[PDB]
Amino acid sequence: MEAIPVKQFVKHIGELYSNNQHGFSEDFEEVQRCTADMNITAEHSNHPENKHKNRYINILAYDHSRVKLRPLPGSKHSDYINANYVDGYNKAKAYIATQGPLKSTFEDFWRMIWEQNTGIIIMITNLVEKGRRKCDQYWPTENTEEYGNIIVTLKSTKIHACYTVRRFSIRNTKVQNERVVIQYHYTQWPDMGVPEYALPVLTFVRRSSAARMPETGPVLVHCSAGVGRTGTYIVIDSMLQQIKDKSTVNVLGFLKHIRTQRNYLVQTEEQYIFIHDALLEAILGK
Ligand SMILES: CNCCNCC(=O)Nc1cccc(C#Cc2ccc(C(=O)O)c(SCc3ccc(Cl)c(Cl)c3)c2)c1
């Protein structure tokens, strides 16, 4: 569970894939239980005033790492958002891992972006997938929309084969004060089966990560629950940064660490194997 050299990592992937992928299963079972005895509380998440603010009853925001909204003129639970700070490579609180916002949380979502000085949104979901509602549209289709004291204008849209880039101009009405928020939206979701090819995800991760300018707030990352694909993106991004910097990889170690920050980050064994596949392709992209 120490940083493994890229060469050894490649050999370690082989060990994990053998014997009907049992090594991957053991690794993922180890991730699933790592915080079981830590008694990590999520009191604010379970408070009755905040229940309608959670997309899934069981997908909570740990107290110690939750993003707190700056108190709002009045309420006692106006500080709550189902969002957590998550570390990145050599950068504590490099991300805000959050659920896909609800119509009832659009204002909180945009206020958090404003208050956190977030300049990048990573959306790793379609609004609807396999006929199920995954996320609500928190942005205007065209032109301007107001979300509480936050005025949001769509400035531009650039559609690529696997992802869309939307630039927004945001401004707080009741208060620099006019800012650019760039949304990187991954759109390629296989209607049957599972991904498939890591190359488009690798390009999405690299281009969305390179867009992080100094000295801005954390990059907001969301999918539906804000755990599965969110954690997947966070592990890939951090690991590509470790590979470039030190030519080492620590998937298990870094994942077990981020599991203390938000529950269920990298939610399935499939996502866990996907990280390894994506990282192998990046290492090979030489
Ligand atoms: C005993 N059970 C295992 C046996 N079968 C072996 C097996 O599954 N291999 C295997 C081998 C290689 C990859 C996979 C996978 C996967 C997968 C499934 C569902 C989802 C999903 O959409 O949730 C995703 S997310 C992908 C993504 C998209 C965009 C971005 Cl931006 C990001 Cl970051 C991440 C990934 C599975």
UniProtKB/Swiss-Prot annotation:
UniProt-annotated binding residues for substrate: 191, 223-229, 267
Source taxon at top rank: Eukaryota
Active site: 223
Known tissue expression: Found in a variety of tissues.
Subcellular location: Membrane
Annotated ranges, domain Tyrosine-protein phosphatase: 24-282
Record text on subunit structure and interactions: Monomer; active form. Homodimer; inactive form. Interacts with CNTN3, CNTN4, CNTN5 and CNTN6.
Entry's family note: Belongs to the protein-tyrosine phosphatase family. Receptor class 5 subfamily.
The protein's role, per its UniProt record: Possesses tyrosine phosphatase activity.
Protein known as: Receptor-type tyrosine-protein phosphatase gamma
Native organism: Homo sapiens
Upper taxonomic lineage: Eukaryota, Metazoa, Chordata, Craniata, Vertebrata
